[PDB]
């Protein structure tokens, strides 16, 4: 009815301990979602153009041109880590768990409130918020995944991370195909390169509408909604990082001269001269056996062009990389291609009392040492004469194509049948939890955005929209915008997300890295005197595991 609630708030996290070291983690989230009525009931096809910015020669990387269908619906997206876990729960998970399985997800909407704003014509303006006991909220669940998948975490548009702060949904839109060509240039390039928006290819047009593709429930103030329980099939994630690179794989060389005194400079010596040694190498014409030349079972990580932009039907896009940079842990200023950089606002981690439009940003320096250090790379001739002469070695200090600032590493690629790499580690709080596998015939090995990728399917996107509340003067043959009573809605969204984890075992003598509250970061996990709150980022793969 009207005065009877249709659900209960719940934001607790439960750890149910099972047999054989497994833990059933139940993350409950509950939010108060506020939704204004849409700008216009009509779907729009909007072409966004930034031809002004790109026209400046050498600025092609800043292309934003595209075409998108903008819809009257709003998306309720909970695909982010911060929605489910507070820093303490994440601390427990990372410090104690070794692997994380995604099990199930269900969500529901209850306690729907619809209100109308009546503004008086009094000389001093005033407005009063009445209820509307008959207005409806349209809720559509795309259980069949008939609509384009649009994860909001990539735009920091998921629900809030604070249970006590109301959150808003995101207006839904999806890309409409377009043809666009942009020939790159540089500062000082003469003339105007070909920079053109070509329209649309009819063979690719796709105009989706929620009304035609999904059943839409109408929820009055006394109604409820529940999506039911979906079950994932994603592969297990590891909360452990690998440190062994190719140089640390296998049996080290026996030391014939061990050190005899403590001290940093009292090194040990192998003894056998490098050309008189034993072992196996992939160098069929060289007698030298060294740690750099000795055969290894396979290659850890791979090299790829960094900051490479490739163009296609829709224009240029950065080539993604599956691993971070090398040595970034020693110097953050060297954090570069491959280390995801998250920007977010006051709903998703930034201090809630901050003023201004500037967002809060952080670069994630993954622990795993699967990355590369392109400055230490080099190529040398097949003859392998040592020391290598100038003409027989290509170095990162060598110009390629006549450019002083570009070297061979910028275009080098070593992905091969021997390559081995790890999945992207979870990013708290702003990291995405799951993502949809592509419908291509050959599917990518991993996604750079989510640790869980969806083999068959995973939960349909949930859409909400304030049903139109017409005035008596409605005339559908009028070309003007529909006349609607100012109406908004507030409804409680509750979700339950179920993981399964294994509790880690101490394999080694020494202790391992752990997350701990300390004097330097103490105040990031408590409110300020004026209620300000922030959710700083936390690393997720502290414990090390042996690669080989």
């Amino acid at each position: 009815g009207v005065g009877i609630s249709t659900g209960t708030f719940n934001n607790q996290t439960e750890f149910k301990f099972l047999e054989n070291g497994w833990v059933y983690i139940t993350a409950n989230s509950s939010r108060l979602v506020h939704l204004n009525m849409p700008e216009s009931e009509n779907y729009r096809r909007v072409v966004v153009n930034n031809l002004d910015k790109t026209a400046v020669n050498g600025n092609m990387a800043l292309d934003d041109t595209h075409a998108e269908i903008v819809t009257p619906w709003s998306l309720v997206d909970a695909n982010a880590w911060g929605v489910w876990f507070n820093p303490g729960d994440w601390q427990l998970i990372v410090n104690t768990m070794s692997e994380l399985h995604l099990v199930s997800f269900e969500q529901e909407i209850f306690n729907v409130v619809l209100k109308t704003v009546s503004e008086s014509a009094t000389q001093p303006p005033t407005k009063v918020y009445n209820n509307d006991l008959t207005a409806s909220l349209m809720v559509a669940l795309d259980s069949n995944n008939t609509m384009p998948f649009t994860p909001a975490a990539m735009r920091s548009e998921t629900l809030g991370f604070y249970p006590w702060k109301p959150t808003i949904p995101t207006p839904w839109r999806y890309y409409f195909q377009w043809d666009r060509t942009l020939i790159p240039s540089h500062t000082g390039t003469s003339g105007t390169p070909t920079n053109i928006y070509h329209g649309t290819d009819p063979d690719d047009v796709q105009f989706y509408t929620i009304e035609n593709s999904v059943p839409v429930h109408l929820l009055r103030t006394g109604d409820e909604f529940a999506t039911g329980t979906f079950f994932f099939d994603c592969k297990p994630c590891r909360l452990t990082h690998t440190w062994q690179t190719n140089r640390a794989l296998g049996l080290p060389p026996f030391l014939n001269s061990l050190p005899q005194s403590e001290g940093g400079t009292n090194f040990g010596y192998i003894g056998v001269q490098q050309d008189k040694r034993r072992g196996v190498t992939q160098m069929g014409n060289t007698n030298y056996i060294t740690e750099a030349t000795i055969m290894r079972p396979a290659e850890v990580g791979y090299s790829a062009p960094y900051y490479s932009f490739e163009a296609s039907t829709q224009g240029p896009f950065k080539t993604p990389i599956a691993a971070g940079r090398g040595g970034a842990q020693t110097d953050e200023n060297q954090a570069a291609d491959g280390d995801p950089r998250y920007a977010f606002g006051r709903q998703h981690g930034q201090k809630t009392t901050t003023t201004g439009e500037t967002p809060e940003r952080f670069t994630y320096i993954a622990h795993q040492d699967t990355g590369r250090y392109p400055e230490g790379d080099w190529i040398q001739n097949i003859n392998f004469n040592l020391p290598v002469t100038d003409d027989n070695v290509l170095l990162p200090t060598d110009p390629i194509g006549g450019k002083t600032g570009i070297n061979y590493t910028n275009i080098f690629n070593t992905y091969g049948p021997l390559t081995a790499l790890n999945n992207v580690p979870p990013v708290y709080p702003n990291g995405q939890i799951w993502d949809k596998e592509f419908d291509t015939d050959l599917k990518p090995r991993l996604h750079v955005n989510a640790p869980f990728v969806c083999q068959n399917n995973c939960p349909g996107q949930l859409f909400v929209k304030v049903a139109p509340n017409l005035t008596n003067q409605y005339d559908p043959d009028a070309s003007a915008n529909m006349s609607r009573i100012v109406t908004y809605s507030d409804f409680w969204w509750k979700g339950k997300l179920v993981f399964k984890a294994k509790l880690r075992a101490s394999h080694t003598w020494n202790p391992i890295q752990q997350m701990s509250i300390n004097v330097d970061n103490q105040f990031n996990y408590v409110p300020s005197n004026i209620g300000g709150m922030k959710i700083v980022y936390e690393k997720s793969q502290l414990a090390p595991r042996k690669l080989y």
Partner: nanobody
Amino acid sequence: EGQLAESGGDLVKPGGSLRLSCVASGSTFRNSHMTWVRQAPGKGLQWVANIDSGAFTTDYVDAVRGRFTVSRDNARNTMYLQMNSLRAEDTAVYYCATMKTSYCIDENCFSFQAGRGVFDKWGQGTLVTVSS
């Protein structure tokens, strides 16, 4: 629709400095390539300078090179022209205008391409003179 509005033009002593302003109305200023042009009385239209939307690059004519400095403030939604080292030749009416960055191919404009050399909208203008 919104329009531009110039201000700051006036007689000033030769060799001095001044600062012309061009207020912009409408949401397109942050997205538009801005330009300054000047017209000496009964003379031919003379380009002064241009600056892109993001203040990434600036261009001037040799006649004002090293003397004029164009700048913009999206927070104030305005453009400015610092006319340092004023010279007798600066006496003219100065306008701020918008350079058309996109030109549509089909007459109904289902396809667009970048270009330069056409000014879409013009401001009111301000008169500047250089004399003692």
